[PDB]
Each structure stands twice: as C-alpha cells, then as structure tokens.
Amino acid sequence: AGPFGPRPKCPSQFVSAHRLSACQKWIHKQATSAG
Amino acid sequence: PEQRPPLLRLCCTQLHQQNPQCTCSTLRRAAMAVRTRQGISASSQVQRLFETARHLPKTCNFAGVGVCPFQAVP
Ligand SMILES: [Li+]
C-alpha cells in the first residue's frame, strides 16, 4: 500500500457503475418472489 | 435457455466495473436502496432481497469474491 497504489474508492465505483441499477432491479425481482 | 436472463447479465456487467474488494460493500448499499425505495417490508421478502444481493458475485461467476458475508438487516 502506497500513495500511488490503485487505491480503490468504492463509493465512486458504485456511482460510476450506475449504482448497480440492473442489480437493484434483479434484487427487487427476486425479493418479491419470496414464499 | 442456457444463456442467463438479460437483466442478470446487465447486473454482472455493472459489477465487473468494480474491484472485487468493493463488490460486497456496494451490493449491501444497493440492497438497502431497493429495500427502502420499494418499501419492501415483508420479512421473507426482505431476507430474500439481502440474500440475493450477497449471492450475486457467485451468481455472476465473480470467483475472486464468492458469497458476501451476512450482515444484520436494518
Ligand atoms: Li478507501
């Protein structure tokens, strides 16, 4: 680990990945099938 | 069909835009967002919501992550 390492920024990656919008829709679809 | 549902594939492509060690944290955030925005409250639905999110790296073959650990549901 160093000042010039890859240094992942998870919140920035999340927004860049559209807040995982398709995963959110998939999660929602699975959730309402419960029971 | 042997190909996955198109929506699942779109999700896996989005997950691949993140580093492995960010995937579980961001999926927890995504699950919380769905749960609140959609008003999911029925216990089995809430449990299945968070479980689905935690399994998505494995559903997607994100081998470097596996299944995300359980965290208490809000
Ligand atoms: Li960080």
XYZ file of all heavy atoms in Angstrom:
834
model
N 0.828 -1.200 0.000
C 0.000 0.000 0.000
C 0.867 1.257 0.000
O 1.794 1.386 0.801
C -0.938 -0.004 1.198
N 0.562 2.185 -0.901
C 1.332 3.399 -1.029
C 0.520 4.545 -1.594
O -0.613 4.366 -2.058
N 1.096 5.750 -1.580
C 0.352 6.928 -2.057
C -0.038 6.853 -3.519
O -0.978 7.541 -3.933
C 1.316 8.091 -1.789
C 2.671 7.459 -1.768
C 2.473 6.088 -1.181
N 0.652 6.040 -4.318
C 0.370 5.930 -5.742
C -0.126 4.541 -6.126
O -0.064 4.166 -7.297
C 1.590 6.364 -6.562
C 2.052 7.762 -6.244
C 3.090 7.986 -5.351
C 1.415 8.854 -6.807
C 3.501 9.273 -5.052
C 1.824 10.145 -6.509
C 2.865 10.352 -5.631
N -0.631 3.773 -5.155
C -1.228 2.498 -5.436
C -2.578 2.648 -6.117
O -3.064 3.760 -6.357
N -3.208 1.512 -6.430
C -4.513 1.580 -7.108
C -5.567 2.332 -6.314
O -6.399 3.027 -6.913
C -4.860 0.109 -7.362
C -3.990 -0.672 -6.428
C -2.733 0.129 -6.278
N -5.553 2.212 -4.988
C -6.417 2.991 -4.106
C -7.891 2.984 -4.517
O -8.457 4.034 -4.846
C -5.900 4.411 -3.932
C -4.520 4.440 -3.311
C -4.068 5.843 -2.995
N -3.295 5.829 -1.763
C -3.288 6.804 -0.867
N -3.966 7.923 -1.057
N -2.595 6.643 0.255
N -8.538 1.821 -4.503
C -9.960 1.756 -4.866
C -10.799 2.673 -3.994
O -10.619 2.727 -2.779
C -10.325 0.289 -4.602
C -9.040 -0.451 -4.617
C -8.010 0.508 -4.102
N -11.757 3.358 -4.615
C -12.723 4.210 -3.920
C -14.092 3.595 -4.190
O -14.721 3.872 -5.215
C -12.654 5.653 -4.418
C -11.270 6.278 -4.373
C -10.664 6.244 -2.987
C -9.269 6.849 -3.005
N -8.536 6.607 -1.739
N -14.551 2.754 -3.268
C -15.776 2.002 -3.524
C -16.997 2.875 -3.804
O -17.764 2.529 -4.721
C -16.029 0.971 -2.414
S -14.682 -0.210 -2.120
N -17.243 3.987 -3.095
C -18.435 4.792 -3.426
C -18.392 5.397 -4.821
O -19.430 5.495 -5.487
C -18.456 5.866 -2.327
C -17.679 5.276 -1.204
C -16.606 4.455 -1.850
N -17.209 5.816 -5.274
C -17.074 6.340 -6.628
C -17.293 5.242 -7.660
O -17.939 5.470 -8.689
C -15.696 6.984 -6.794
O -15.539 7.551 -8.083
N -16.773 4.041 -7.399
C -17.012 2.927 -8.309
C -18.495 2.611 -8.400
O -19.007 2.311 -9.482
C -16.227 1.695 -7.860
C -14.739 1.902 -7.923
C -13.943 0.668 -7.578
O -14.469 -0.432 -7.433
N -12.654 0.852 -7.438
N -19.198 2.693 -7.273
C -20.631 2.418 -7.243
C -21.392 3.383 -8.137
O -22.225 2.968 -8.951
C -21.116 2.523 -5.800
C -22.575 2.199 -5.601
C -23.074 0.936 -5.872
C -23.440 3.162 -5.107
C -24.412 0.641 -5.650
C -24.776 2.878 -4.897
C -25.261 1.614 -5.163
N -21.122 4.683 -8.005
C -21.842 5.652 -8.825
C -21.448 5.524 -10.292
O -22.297 5.639 -11.184
C -21.708 7.085 -8.273
C -22.414 7.202 -6.934
C -20.259 7.473 -8.131
N -20.173 5.234 -10.566
C -19.739 5.040 -11.947
C -20.411 3.827 -12.583
O -20.659 3.815 -13.797
C -18.214 4.912 -12.012
O -17.569 6.102 -11.586
N -20.714 2.803 -11.778
C -21.425 1.606 -12.211
C -22.939 1.775 -12.162
O -23.675 0.786 -12.021
C -20.979 0.392 -11.397
N -23.415 3.016 -12.268
C -24.844 3.326 -12.287
C -25.560 2.834 -11.031
O -26.730 2.436 -11.083
C -25.531 2.821 -13.562
C -24.961 3.386 -14.829
N -25.751 3.731 -15.903
C -23.684 3.644 -15.205
C -24.989 4.192 -16.879
N -23.731 4.148 -16.481
N -24.856 2.865 -9.899
C -25.397 2.390 -8.632
C -25.895 0.955 -8.744
O -26.815 0.538 -8.041
C -26.447 3.348 -8.076
C -25.866 4.730 -7.907
C -26.614 5.569 -6.912
N -25.970 6.866 -6.764
C -26.292 7.765 -5.851
N -27.218 7.519 -4.942
N -25.665 8.939 -5.848
N -25.254 0.181 -9.617
C -25.644 -1.205 -9.847
C -27.140 -1.312 -10.152
O -27.826 -2.210 -9.673
C -25.229 -2.117 -8.686
C -23.756 -2.059 -8.283
C -23.526 -2.951 -7.062
C -22.853 -2.458 -9.437
N -27.644 -0.389 -10.974
C -29.078 -0.280 -11.251
C -29.700 -1.592 -11.704
O -30.833 -1.912 -11.317
C -29.305 0.788 -12.331
O -28.676 0.456 -13.560
N -29.011 -2.329 -12.579
C -29.573 -3.590 -13.052
C -29.592 -4.631 -11.939
O -30.517 -5.450 -11.854
C -28.793 -4.110 -14.258
N -28.566 -4.623 -11.085
C -28.588 -5.492 -9.914
C -29.730 -5.128 -8.977
O -30.367 -6.016 -8.407
C -27.263 -5.434 -9.154
S -25.809 -5.855 -10.150
N -29.990 -3.830 -8.786
C -31.119 -3.426 -7.951
C -32.433 -3.972 -8.497
O -33.262 -4.491 -7.741
C -31.166 -1.903 -7.804
C -30.012 -1.331 -6.997
C -30.258 0.096 -6.534
O -31.364 0.449 -6.136
N -29.217 0.913 -6.562
N -32.638 -3.872 -9.809
C -33.853 -4.415 -10.408
C -33.923 -5.926 -10.232
O -34.991 -6.477 -9.952
C -33.923 -4.039 -11.893
C -34.169 -2.571 -12.157
C -34.195 -2.273 -13.643
C -34.429 -0.794 -13.890
N -35.652 -0.322 -13.187
N -32.795 -6.614 -10.405
C -32.752 -8.065 -10.247
C -33.071 -8.478 -8.812
O -33.854 -9.410 -8.577
C -31.368 -8.578 -10.664
C -31.261 -10.056 -10.525
C -30.691 -10.751 -9.492
C -31.790 -11.037 -11.422
N -30.823 -12.100 -9.695
C -31.494 -12.301 -10.876
C -32.483 -10.971 -12.639
C -31.868 -13.488 -11.496
C -32.857 -12.150 -13.250
C -32.543 -13.394 -12.683
N -32.437 -7.793 -7.850
C -32.665 -7.997 -6.418
C -34.145 -7.832 -6.090
O -34.753 -8.658 -5.397
C -31.775 -7.023 -5.610
C -30.301 -7.451 -5.660
C -32.230 -6.907 -4.169
C -29.314 -6.350 -5.307
N -34.745 -6.757 -6.599
C -36.159 -6.483 -6.363
C -37.024 -7.620 -6.899
O -37.918 -8.122 -6.207
C -36.521 -5.160 -7.033
C -37.946 -4.748 -6.841
N -38.578 -3.850 -7.673
C -38.860 -5.100 -5.906
C -39.821 -3.674 -7.263
N -40.017 -4.421 -6.192
N -36.747 -8.051 -8.133
C -37.490 -9.137 -8.765
C -37.406 -10.419 -7.945
O -38.416 -11.098 -7.737
C -36.934 -9.355 -10.175
C -37.241 -10.696 -10.815
C -36.514 -10.818 -12.151
C -36.693 -12.193 -12.768
N -38.130 -12.527 -12.961
N -36.212 -10.763 -7.462
C -36.076 -11.965 -6.645
C -36.796 -11.817 -5.312
O -37.422 -12.770 -4.833
C -34.601 -12.294 -6.423
C -33.898 -12.815 -7.659
C -34.455 -14.143 -8.126
O -35.005 -14.913 -7.342
N -34.320 -14.417 -9.410
N -36.719 -10.633 -4.703
C -37.286 -10.434 -3.375
C -38.789 -10.676 -3.374
O -39.318 -11.338 -2.474
C -36.980 -9.030 -2.867
N -39.492 -10.149 -4.372
C -40.944 -10.262 -4.374
C -41.435 -11.655 -4.746
O -42.642 -11.899 -4.692
C -41.590 -9.181 -5.247
O -41.199 -9.348 -6.615
C -41.194 -7.796 -4.756
N -40.537 -12.574 -5.096
C -40.892 -13.970 -5.309
C -40.820 -14.799 -4.032
O -41.082 -16.006 -4.083
C -39.985 -14.593 -6.377
O -40.123 -13.927 -7.621
N -40.476 -14.186 -2.898
C -40.302 -14.938 -1.662
C -41.596 -15.630 -1.254
O -42.684 -15.052 -1.323
C -39.846 -14.008 -0.540
N -41.470 -16.879 -0.824
C -42.616 -17.658 -0.402
C -43.480 -18.112 -1.561
O -44.467 -18.822 -1.370
N -33.395 -22.174 -21.932
C -32.243 -21.443 -22.471
C -31.029 -21.516 -21.549
O -31.172 -21.390 -20.334
C -32.759 -20.005 -22.551
C -34.229 -20.148 -22.731
C -34.615 -21.349 -21.915
N -29.844 -21.720 -22.126
C -28.624 -21.775 -21.332
C -28.048 -20.396 -21.032
O -27.342 -20.245 -20.029
C -27.578 -22.668 -22.006
C -27.790 -24.155 -21.760
C -27.442 -24.563 -20.341
O -26.333 -24.220 -19.878
O -28.280 -25.217 -19.686
N -28.325 -19.396 -21.864
C -27.947 -18.034 -21.517
C -28.832 -17.519 -20.389
O -30.000 -17.889 -20.263
C -28.067 -17.105 -22.725
C -27.038 -17.353 -23.815
C -27.062 -16.273 -24.876
O -27.603 -16.464 -25.964
N -26.475 -15.128 -24.566
N -28.259 -16.653 -19.570
C -28.927 -16.110 -18.406
C -29.960 -15.058 -18.804
O -29.943 -14.546 -19.928
C -27.883 -15.492 -17.481
C -27.018 -16.516 -16.759
C -25.828 -15.865 -16.077
N -24.902 -15.291 -17.044
C -23.760 -14.698 -16.727
N -23.365 -14.584 -15.469
N -22.994 -14.205 -17.696
N -30.872 -14.718 -17.893
C -31.805 -13.626 -18.162
C -31.051 -12.347 -18.477
O -30.035 -12.037 -17.835
C -32.585 -13.506 -16.843
C -32.544 -14.895 -16.287
C -31.158 -15.372 -16.604
N -31.504 -11.590 -19.472
C -30.760 -10.381 -19.863
C -30.489 -9.417 -18.720
O -29.394 -8.838 -18.651
C -31.640 -9.781 -20.968
C -32.280 -10.989 -21.603
C -32.570 -11.918 -20.441
N -31.444 -9.247 -17.803
C -31.248 -8.311 -16.704
C -30.111 -8.757 -15.786
O -29.346 -7.927 -15.279
C -32.553 -8.172 -15.923
C -32.517 -7.242 -14.712
C -32.189 -5.820 -15.130
C -33.850 -7.299 -13.979
N -30.007 -10.064 -15.536
C -28.916 -10.574 -14.718
C -27.571 -10.291 -15.373
O -26.624 -9.856 -14.710
C -29.111 -12.067 -14.465
C -28.009 -12.755 -13.658
C -27.785 -12.069 -12.307
C -28.322 -14.226 -13.483
N -27.477 -10.492 -16.688
C -26.243 -10.177 -17.400
C -25.886 -8.699 -17.292
O -24.713 -8.354 -17.108
C -26.362 -10.625 -18.856
C -26.271 -12.132 -19.000
C -27.256 -12.679 -19.998
N -27.049 -12.107 -21.317
C -27.736 -12.480 -22.383
N -28.716 -13.366 -22.289
N -27.421 -11.965 -23.568
N -26.877 -7.807 -17.407
C -26.586 -6.386 -17.231
C -26.027 -6.110 -15.840
O -25.104 -5.306 -15.674
C -27.840 -5.544 -17.446
C -28.468 -5.491 -18.829
C -29.667 -4.564 -18.792
C -27.437 -5.030 -19.864
N -26.590 -6.764 -14.824
C -26.079 -6.625 -13.465
C -24.636 -7.094 -13.370
O -23.784 -6.414 -12.781
C -26.978 -7.425 -12.510
S -26.252 -7.716 -10.873
N -24.333 -8.255 -13.953
C -22.970 -8.764 -13.870
C -21.984 -7.826 -14.557
O -20.864 -7.639 -14.075
C -22.882 -10.184 -14.426
S -23.909 -11.425 -13.556
N -22.387 -7.209 -15.672
C -21.521 -6.238 -16.335
C -21.254 -5.036 -15.434
O -20.122 -4.552 -15.347
C -22.140 -5.820 -17.671
O -22.194 -6.962 -18.530
C -21.324 -4.727 -18.339
N -22.283 -4.552 -14.734
C -22.086 -3.447 -13.801
C -21.160 -3.837 -12.658
O -20.281 -3.057 -12.271
C -23.426 -2.947 -13.268
C -24.254 -2.247 -14.329
C -25.605 -1.803 -13.822
O -26.184 -2.427 -12.934
N -26.119 -0.718 -14.379
N -21.338 -5.040 -12.102
C -20.466 -5.485 -11.017
C -19.011 -5.551 -11.463
O -18.101 -5.252 -10.679
C -20.923 -6.848 -10.493
C -22.126 -6.838 -9.568
C -22.590 -8.256 -9.268
C -21.753 -6.088 -8.294
N -18.771 -5.938 -12.717
C -17.420 -6.002 -13.255
C -16.766 -4.638 -13.388
O -15.558 -4.580 -13.620
C -17.416 -6.682 -14.622
C -17.712 -8.143 -14.566
N -18.094 -8.865 -15.675
C -17.689 -9.021 -13.535
C -18.292 -10.125 -15.332
N -18.054 -10.245 -14.038
N -17.515 -3.551 -13.259
C -16.914 -2.223 -13.224
C -16.321 -1.881 -11.866
O -15.815 -0.769 -11.688
C -17.952 -1.174 -13.612
C -18.561 -1.404 -14.979
C -19.596 -0.362 -15.337
O -20.741 -0.688 -15.645
N -19.198 0.905 -15.301
N -16.379 -2.802 -10.912
C -15.884 -2.567 -9.566
C -14.772 -3.552 -9.225
O -14.703 -4.655 -9.777
C -17.027 -2.710 -8.560
C -18.229 -1.849 -8.893
C -19.254 -1.852 -7.798
O -19.882 -0.839 -7.503
N -19.431 -3.003 -7.184
N -13.902 -3.150 -8.296
C -12.893 -4.061 -7.792
C -13.531 -5.117 -6.888
O -14.500 -4.834 -6.180
C -11.848 -3.297 -6.985
C -11.066 -2.315 -7.820
O -10.987 -1.142 -7.488
N -10.468 -2.789 -8.894
N -12.967 -6.330 -6.866
C -13.520 -7.401 -6.018
C -13.759 -6.998 -4.579
O -14.805 -7.328 -4.014
C -12.459 -8.503 -6.133
C -11.868 -8.295 -7.489
C -11.864 -6.811 -7.716
N -12.821 -6.283 -3.976
C -12.930 -5.917 -2.575
C -13.893 -4.754 -2.333
O -14.076 -4.354 -1.181
C -11.538 -5.715 -1.957
C -10.761 -4.533 -2.476
C -9.976 -4.779 -3.757
O -10.351 -5.533 -4.653
N -8.884 -4.080 -3.858
N -14.530 -4.223 -3.384
C -15.647 -3.292 -3.253
C -17.010 -3.936 -3.477
O -18.027 -3.319 -3.141
C -15.518 -2.147 -4.266
S -14.198 -0.962 -3.942
N -17.059 -5.136 -4.051
C -18.321 -5.673 -4.548
C -19.338 -5.895 -3.422
O -20.496 -5.484 -3.538
C -18.055 -6.926 -5.393
O -17.497 -6.544 -6.666
C -19.320 -7.715 -5.615
N -18.924 -6.511 -2.311
C -19.899 -6.811 -1.263
C -20.432 -5.546 -0.597
O -21.633 -5.445 -0.325
C -19.315 -7.782 -0.240
S -19.036 -9.417 -0.929
N -19.557 -4.570 -0.338
C -19.997 -3.318 0.269
C -20.996 -2.600 -0.630
O -22.021 -2.091 -0.159
C -18.784 -2.429 0.558
O -19.164 -1.193 1.143
N -20.725 -2.564 -1.934
C -21.634 -1.872 -2.839
C -22.936 -2.636 -3.037
O -23.986 -2.014 -3.222
C -20.966 -1.581 -4.186
O -20.593 -2.808 -4.823
C -19.738 -0.684 -4.005
N -22.897 -3.967 -2.995
C -24.135 -4.733 -3.092
C -25.007 -4.550 -1.858
O -26.236 -4.541 -1.968
C -23.827 -6.206 -3.343
C -23.531 -6.522 -4.814
C -22.898 -7.890 -4.942
C -24.791 -6.432 -5.661
N -24.391 -4.400 -0.682
C -25.155 -4.082 0.520
C -25.832 -2.724 0.383
O -27.007 -2.566 0.732
C -24.221 -4.115 1.735
C -24.762 -3.492 3.002
C -25.534 -4.482 3.797
N -25.841 -3.948 5.113
C -26.555 -4.596 6.017
N -27.054 -5.795 5.768
N -26.771 -4.027 7.198
N -25.107 -1.736 -0.151
C -25.698 -0.427 -0.403
C -26.848 -0.525 -1.399
O -27.904 0.090 -1.210
C -24.614 0.525 -0.918
C -25.098 1.933 -1.186
C -23.950 2.860 -1.527
N -24.442 4.162 -1.955
C -23.669 5.144 -2.393
N -22.353 5.014 -2.444
N -24.228 6.280 -2.798
N -26.662 -1.310 -2.461
C -27.714 -1.488 -3.459
C -28.946 -2.152 -2.854
O -30.083 -1.778 -3.168
C -27.175 -2.326 -4.620
N -28.735 -3.152 -1.992
C -29.853 -3.831 -1.347
C -30.622 -2.884 -0.436
O -31.860 -2.873 -0.442
C -29.349 -5.045 -0.566
N -29.905 -2.089 0.361
C -30.576 -1.118 1.216
C -31.377 -0.124 0.393
O -32.483 0.259 0.779
C -29.569 -0.375 2.088
C -28.940 -1.186 3.198
S -27.769 -0.140 4.088
C -28.575 0.045 5.673
N -30.828 0.303 -0.748
C -31.515 1.259 -1.608
C -32.825 0.687 -2.140
O -33.869 1.348 -2.083
C -30.588 1.685 -2.752
N -32.790 -0.556 -2.644
C -34.001 -1.236 -3.125
C -35.012 -1.382 -2.008
O -36.206 -1.112 -2.186
C -33.662 -2.631 -3.685
C -34.950 -3.439 -3.948
C -32.857 -2.512 -4.926
N -34.558 -1.892 -0.866
C -35.468 -2.173 0.232
C -36.236 -0.921 0.620
O -37.461 -0.960 0.792
C -34.674 -2.736 1.413
C -35.497 -3.446 2.477
C -36.047 -2.477 3.509
N -36.594 -3.166 4.671
C -35.891 -3.485 5.748
N -34.602 -3.203 5.840
N -36.496 -4.104 6.759
N -35.544 0.215 0.718
C -36.229 1.427 1.147
C -37.016 2.076 0.019
O -38.165 2.472 0.224
C -35.269 2.418 1.798
O -35.903 3.697 1.887
C -34.088 2.575 0.982
N -36.430 2.184 -1.173
C -37.127 2.845 -2.269
C -38.415 2.113 -2.629
O -39.431 2.748 -2.934
C -36.194 2.941 -3.473
C -36.463 4.110 -4.373
C -35.347 4.306 -5.367
N -35.133 3.110 -6.169
C -34.032 2.372 -6.146
N -32.964 2.741 -5.458
N -34.005 1.232 -6.828
N -38.397 0.785 -2.588
C -39.564 -0.017 -2.933
C -40.449 -0.344 -1.736
O -41.499 -0.973 -1.915
C -39.137 -1.312 -3.635
C -38.505 -1.100 -5.006
C -39.512 -0.681 -6.067
O -40.723 -0.725 -5.846
N -39.011 -0.281 -7.230
N -40.060 0.057 -0.530
C -40.877 -0.222 0.640
C -41.051 -1.697 0.926
O -42.134 -2.123 1.352
N -40.009 -2.493 0.696
C -40.079 -3.922 0.981
C -40.024 -4.123 2.490
O -39.051 -3.732 3.145
C -38.949 -4.682 0.277
C -38.935 -4.375 -1.223
C -39.093 -6.176 0.518
C -40.218 -4.728 -1.931
N -41.067 -4.744 3.047
C -41.173 -4.890 4.496
C -41.501 -6.311 4.948
O -41.174 -6.686 6.078
C -42.199 -3.906 5.065
O -41.686 -2.585 5.088
N -42.154 -7.101 4.097
C -42.484 -8.475 4.466
C -41.202 -9.246 4.754
O -40.254 -9.192 3.970
C -43.253 -9.145 3.328
N -41.175 -9.966 5.879
C -39.912 -10.493 6.396
C -39.207 -11.393 5.385
O -37.998 -11.260 5.159
C -40.142 -11.229 7.718
O -40.534 -10.329 8.740
N -39.942 -12.323 4.773
C -39.316 -13.245 3.828
C -38.800 -12.510 2.596
O -37.750 -12.871 2.051
C -40.288 -14.358 3.439
O -41.409 -13.830 2.758
N -39.521 -11.475 2.147
C -39.051 -10.683 1.011
C -37.775 -9.927 1.355
O -36.846 -9.867 0.543
C -40.125 -9.701 0.546
C -41.354 -10.365 -0.041
C -42.299 -9.377 -0.696
O -42.131 -8.163 -0.579
N -43.295 -9.894 -1.399
N -37.719 -9.332 2.547
C -36.527 -8.595 2.960
C -35.331 -9.533 3.062
O -34.229 -9.217 2.600
C -36.792 -7.852 4.281
C -35.529 -7.185 4.773
C -37.910 -6.831 4.110
N -35.527 -10.699 3.681
C -34.439 -11.665 3.788
C -33.961 -12.114 2.411
O -32.754 -12.178 2.152
C -34.886 -12.855 4.633
C -35.103 -12.510 6.099
C -35.793 -13.617 6.856
O -35.999 -14.705 6.323
N -36.161 -13.345 8.100
N -34.898 -12.422 1.512
C -34.520 -12.877 0.179
C -33.828 -11.769 -0.618
O -32.916 -12.045 -1.403
C -35.755 -13.403 -0.558
C -35.454 -14.019 -1.903
C -36.675 -14.701 -2.501
N -36.378 -15.255 -3.817
C -35.885 -16.468 -4.034
N -35.739 -17.340 -3.047
N -35.526 -16.812 -5.268
N -34.245 -10.519 -0.406
C -33.614 -9.364 -1.034
C -32.129 -9.314 -0.701
O -31.270 -9.265 -1.593
C -34.338 -8.107 -0.541
C -34.086 -6.740 -1.170
C -35.230 -5.799 -0.815
C -32.768 -6.149 -0.710
N -31.812 -9.319 0.593
C -30.418 -9.236 1.005
C -29.638 -10.488 0.622
O -28.467 -10.394 0.239
C -30.311 -8.904 2.497
C -30.574 -7.455 2.797
C -31.859 -6.991 3.025
C -29.531 -6.544 2.814
C -32.091 -5.647 3.285
C -29.754 -5.202 3.076
C -31.036 -4.755 3.310
N -30.269 -11.664 0.691
C -29.579 -12.887 0.284
C -29.227 -12.863 -1.199
O -28.125 -13.261 -1.594
C -30.438 -14.117 0.593
C -29.769 -15.396 0.151
C -30.554 -16.599 0.564
O -30.372 -17.002 1.726
O -31.365 -17.109 -0.241
N -30.173 -12.433 -2.035
C -29.910 -12.354 -3.464
C -28.711 -11.454 -3.736
O -27.824 -11.799 -4.530
C -31.156 -11.840 -4.194
O -32.230 -12.770 -4.035
C -30.890 -11.688 -5.674
N -28.674 -10.295 -3.076
C -27.553 -9.381 -3.247
C -26.239 -10.033 -2.840
O -25.237 -9.928 -3.557
C -27.806 -8.094 -2.460
N -26.226 -10.735 -1.706
C -24.984 -11.331 -1.231
C -24.502 -12.473 -2.116
O -23.304 -12.780 -2.113
C -25.154 -11.826 0.203
C -25.293 -10.717 1.229
C -25.658 -11.270 2.593
N -24.975 -12.530 2.853
C -25.565 -13.715 2.902
N -26.881 -13.834 2.834
N -24.815 -14.805 3.025
N -25.402 -13.116 -2.854
C -25.023 -14.209 -3.736
C -24.664 -13.756 -5.138
O -24.111 -14.558 -5.891
C -26.138 -15.247 -3.823
C -26.109 -16.222 -2.706
N -25.636 -17.506 -2.855
C -26.454 -16.092 -1.407
C -25.704 -18.133 -1.697
N -26.205 -17.299 -0.804
N -24.969 -12.514 -5.505
C -24.730 -12.063 -6.873
C -23.306 -12.255 -7.368
O -23.148 -12.597 -8.551
C -25.202 -10.620 -7.075
C -26.658 -10.517 -7.513
C -27.113 -9.081 -7.468
C -26.858 -11.108 -8.899
N -22.243 -12.042 -6.579
C -20.914 -12.330 -7.137
C -20.808 -13.775 -7.598
O -20.266 -14.046 -8.674
C -19.957 -11.975 -5.990
C -20.740 -11.009 -5.137
C -22.148 -11.507 -5.206
N -21.388 -14.706 -6.836
C -21.362 -16.113 -7.226
C -22.335 -16.399 -8.367
O -22.026 -17.189 -9.267
C -21.650 -17.000 -6.015
C -21.572 -18.491 -6.306
C -22.956 -19.090 -6.433
C -23.717 -18.933 -5.134
N -25.157 -18.714 -5.386
N -23.520 -15.778 -8.345
C -24.433 -15.895 -9.479
C -23.770 -15.423 -10.768
O -24.058 -15.953 -11.849
C -25.712 -15.092 -9.217
O -26.210 -15.373 -7.901
C -26.787 -15.442 -10.241
N -22.862 -14.453 -10.667
C -22.172 -13.851 -11.800
C -20.838 -14.514 -12.128
O -20.205 -14.124 -13.113
C -21.931 -12.359 -11.537
S -23.393 -11.301 -11.609
N -20.391 -15.490 -11.332
C -19.075 -16.126 -11.501
C -17.922 -15.152 -11.241
O -16.884 -15.201 -11.903
C -18.917 -16.855 -12.841
C -19.722 -18.138 -12.901
O -20.855 -18.152 -13.380
N -19.137 -19.226 -12.411
N -18.115 -14.262 -10.268
C -17.083 -13.358 -9.762
C -16.264 -14.159 -8.753
O -16.391 -14.009 -7.534
C -17.752 -12.161 -9.096
C -17.014 -10.861 -9.257
C -17.593 -9.807 -9.945
C -15.769 -10.674 -8.682
C -16.933 -8.600 -10.085
C -15.102 -9.468 -8.818
C -15.684 -8.431 -9.520
N -15.402 -15.032 -9.285
C -14.769 -16.066 -8.467
C -13.919 -15.487 -7.345
O -13.830 -16.083 -6.266
C -13.938 -16.999 -9.346
N -13.289 -14.336 -7.570
C -12.442 -13.743 -6.550
C -13.156 -13.248 -5.310
O -12.490 -12.782 -4.382
N -14.487 -13.339 -5.257
C -15.283 -12.809 -4.155
C -16.064 -13.909 -3.446
O -16.026 -14.021 -2.216
C -16.225 -11.678 -4.627
C -17.155 -11.243 -3.502
C -15.419 -10.501 -5.142
N -16.784 -14.729 -4.207
C -17.671 -15.702 -3.603
C -18.957 -15.050 -3.124
O -19.414 -14.041 -3.661
N -19.540 -15.639 -2.093
C -20.763 -15.119 -1.496
C -20.382 -14.128 -0.404
O -19.498 -14.402 0.412
C -21.619 -16.269 -0.940
C -22.799 -15.728 -0.165
C -22.083 -17.177 -2.076
N -21.043 -12.977 -0.386
C -20.749 -11.962 0.611
C -21.240 -12.398 1.986
O -22.282 -13.042 2.100
C -21.474 -10.685 0.246
S -20.934 -10.032 -1.357
N -20.532 -12.023 3.047
C -20.970 -12.406 4.392
C -22.288 -11.755 4.780
O -22.639 -10.659 4.338
C -19.831 -11.909 5.288
C -19.166 -10.833 4.494
C -19.252 -11.294 3.075
N -23.015 -12.464 5.631
C -24.252 -11.955 6.197
C -23.973 -10.776 7.117
O -23.051 -10.810 7.934
C -24.943 -13.063 6.993
C -26.231 -12.633 7.625
C -27.387 -12.531 6.866
C -26.290 -12.321 8.972
C -28.576 -12.124 7.435
C -27.480 -11.919 9.552
C -28.624 -11.819 8.780
N -24.776 -9.729 6.974
C -24.789 -8.605 7.896
C -26.230 -8.368 8.314
O -27.142 -8.480 7.490
C -24.224 -7.339 7.241
C -22.779 -7.469 6.780
C -22.307 -6.267 5.982
O -22.268 -6.300 4.755
N -21.939 -5.200 6.681
N -26.430 -8.053 9.596
C -27.772 -7.858 10.129
C -28.572 -6.909 9.249
O -28.068 -5.881 8.792
C -27.694 -7.302 11.553
N -29.822 -7.273 9.003
C -30.693 -6.468 8.145
C -31.297 -5.342 8.979
O -31.806 -5.603 10.080
C -31.780 -7.340 7.530
C -32.699 -6.495 6.670
C -31.157 -8.459 6.714
N -31.261 -4.089 8.497
C -31.795 -2.903 9.181
C -33.276 -3.041 9.501
O -34.010 -3.530 8.644
C -31.598 -1.789 8.149
C -30.490 -2.266 7.285
C -30.626 -3.746 7.211
Li -10.799 3.533 0.764
